[model samples]
Target: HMLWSQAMESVRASDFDLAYADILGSNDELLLVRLMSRTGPVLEQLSDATLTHLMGNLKHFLQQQSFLECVIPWIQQVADLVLSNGPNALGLTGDSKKDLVFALQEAASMDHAQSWMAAKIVELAEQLRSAWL
Candidate 1:
């Protein structure tokens, strides 16, 4: 819990790398998933390394189909943020957002145990649609 609080503080301070390290390394799935829902100021500071770290973790979770469901809302939130920022937002590029989508698609492709693949695909589509609209 202390780590989670610290992570939030780091996020508030715009120290996303430290926040990510705190969350991803702490064995706290709940905290990790919750971080997905954090956007705006927190996500604005998101580094490529932290995003890569998140994808690595998500890939493992998808492989095991563990906590797959929890990731959906998180991804959706990210999608929303990405759309709000458009393709060339500071630090958060379209490619950066696409990387996460790609990772999610890869995970969905490997997700045999959970029924979340369809949902994730649809969520991505919706995000894209809204972005284009």
Candidate 2:
């Protein structure tokens, strides 16, 4: 992923679909859902019932979902790629996964001219399901 960041301008448009698809699928299937039960939900559940009342609690769920929907593709890309290629998953992590996570954030912030597609998404689902092998 870091290597890709170095050559972002050189990355072909065709490759984005593969990268985007892999990462997005992973985000939906693994990362975001896992996040809900982890520190995220725990902290939200702990907030006081007074003052702001339930707004803080409601915002936590809504914002997490909204953020996921808005950047769903970026969410997929980072999560999948690291799990697939990172040393931790592959038993190769000399460096922390933090670098790749940061790289993903950078990639997510960029504007893509190509709009997301439904057919392409279905294609990605099929491809990602196969990736577990």
Candidate 3:
């Protein structure tokens, strides 16, 4: 199965549960998981070790690149929204979202990056929070 084709078509259409587990655990291309989130495959679970490690890696890449500042705050808002709201089992939520924020907050701890990220975080967070409500 071509991975990109799987992504473009429908990874979840067949209801494969462990599909994303391997993706997270095995793939060298880290951003693959970003699509995994929106593509609606249930990572359905990870030890958080698997997920958190990936989280930090993305944060590392983000911080180093220094341009995707928006993504770091994006994670924060995503965490906040997922924690407060209901379901959507295919994506990050609950403990996963909480720990994701922990990873996000870890990235935000730069303090050097906060002025704008914090401001925009609130703006974006408020939008999604309200939209979800």
Model number with the top TM-score? 1
Tens digit per residue, CA lDDT, model 1, 13-41: 87887888778778677788777556332
Poorest stretch of ten by lDDT in candidate 2: 42-51
| Cα lDDT tens digits for candidate 2, 29-129 | 34333333322222112222221222232233333333434344433442355356652332222222333233333433344444543333334344433
Residue-wise C-alpha lDDT for candidate 3, range 1-133, written one tens digit per residue = 3555554444455433334444555564544545544554232344444445555555555445343443444354444445565334225345544443344444444555456765554454444344333
lDDT of 1 at 16: 81
lDDT scores of the candidates, listed in order: 0.62, 0.33, 0.46
Model 2 score (lDDT): 0.33
- What's the TM-score of each model vs. the native? 0.52, 0.23, 0.40
Each model's RMSD to truth, in Å?
5.2, 18.2, 7.0
Instruction: Output the better candidate (1/2) by lDDT.
Output: 1
Kindly report which residue pairs in candidate 1 clash with one another.
Answer: none
Clashes of each: 0, 6, 0
Pairwise TM-score winner, candidates 1 and 2: 1
Better of 1 and 3 by TM-score: 1
| C-alpha-based local distance difference test score of model 1 | 0.62
Q: What shift in Å separates residue 53 of candidate 2 from its native position after superposition?
A: 23
Clashing pairs in 3: none
Q: What residue pairs are clashing in model 2?
A: 23-76, 23-77, 24-76, 24-77, 87-92, 87-93
